[PDB]
Design a protein around this ligand. Sequence first.
Ligand SMILES: CC(C)[C@H](N)C(=O)O
Ligand SMILES: [Mg+2]
Length: 364
Amino acid sequence: NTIPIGIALAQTSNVALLGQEQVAGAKIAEKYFNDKGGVNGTPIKLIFQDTAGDEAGTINAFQTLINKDKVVGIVGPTLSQQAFSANPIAERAKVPVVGPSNTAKGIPEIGDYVARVSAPVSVVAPNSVKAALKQNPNIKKVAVFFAQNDAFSKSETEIFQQTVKDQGLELVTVQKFQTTDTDFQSQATNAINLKPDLVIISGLAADGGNLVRQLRELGYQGAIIGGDGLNTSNVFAVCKALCDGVLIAQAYSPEYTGEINKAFRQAYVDQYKKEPPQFSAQAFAAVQVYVESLKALDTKNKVSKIQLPELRTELNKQLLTGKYNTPLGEISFTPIGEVVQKDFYVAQIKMEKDGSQGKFTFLK
Ligand SMILES: CC(C)[C@H](N)C(=O)O
Ligand SMILES: [Mg+2]
């Protein structure tokens, strides 16, 4: 006997350039927690249902997990775009959802069954603008790009634009693109003609990487910030040496000294031969929230005897009250499921000259 927890992430499509790191973190969590006896001796069982890259696929994944797989709760989905469509399904069904990486404004507000462990754009994004200004205090002109079809990108770009204004900088253009575009020559040229000192990009990974590469190809030599959708080593293949120097805010640091981060990091590095990325740590934290909440609930009200609808409702109630020492740091939730988290960072892509290898360097 095991306790089923649903994992609904993008395992296919270009959205999997983000989702695959989340899957990796979830699997590390499953082993970590099951090796510790699961829920008071009862193992958990992660049930993975691929969402693919759109809303329909996410809705289908959620419905399958809820109805066929009888899960006690869901971790997912990957994108805020998917969450706004699918999370109401879980809300209506009274099944908890813990978002690992949905950072758009409004996610926890979807309902009483929706929480997230991922700090939102309003607190994450401004960090990278400040870091760019530290590296070049003479930045004056800023060009902004965003994916107009993606909910998170639209939410993130508003924060970047407001931050640019509040820092007293000149916003010289806002250019739009689609996440499915591969070519950005006209937008990139129109921005470059305005002589920006800083370029900020809110898109996802393939699109963001292609845009970075093209800006450099077209002669742009200024600073570049990527938003959360570029926050993956999967961009390295796309922009190669021309990824070098891109600044990306972080809601996780491998060097954070919390005991569980040490264990998570060691497990990750031993397997993948590089530092754990933010998305992996966030997925681990989401699974941790479920395991620790299930343990607390089970101690007070043995879960093997609770029928599923009540188990789901009691688990949701429990998780919202918990405090968790996770790889992300000490976190908890507001009464509506927003994460409470203290520390943020900025990292910078450092490519090797040949362009075939790189890493994220954390700024001090
Ligand atoms: C990069 C992506 C996972 C983004 N944080 C979102 O909310 O969709
Ligand atoms: Mg909520």
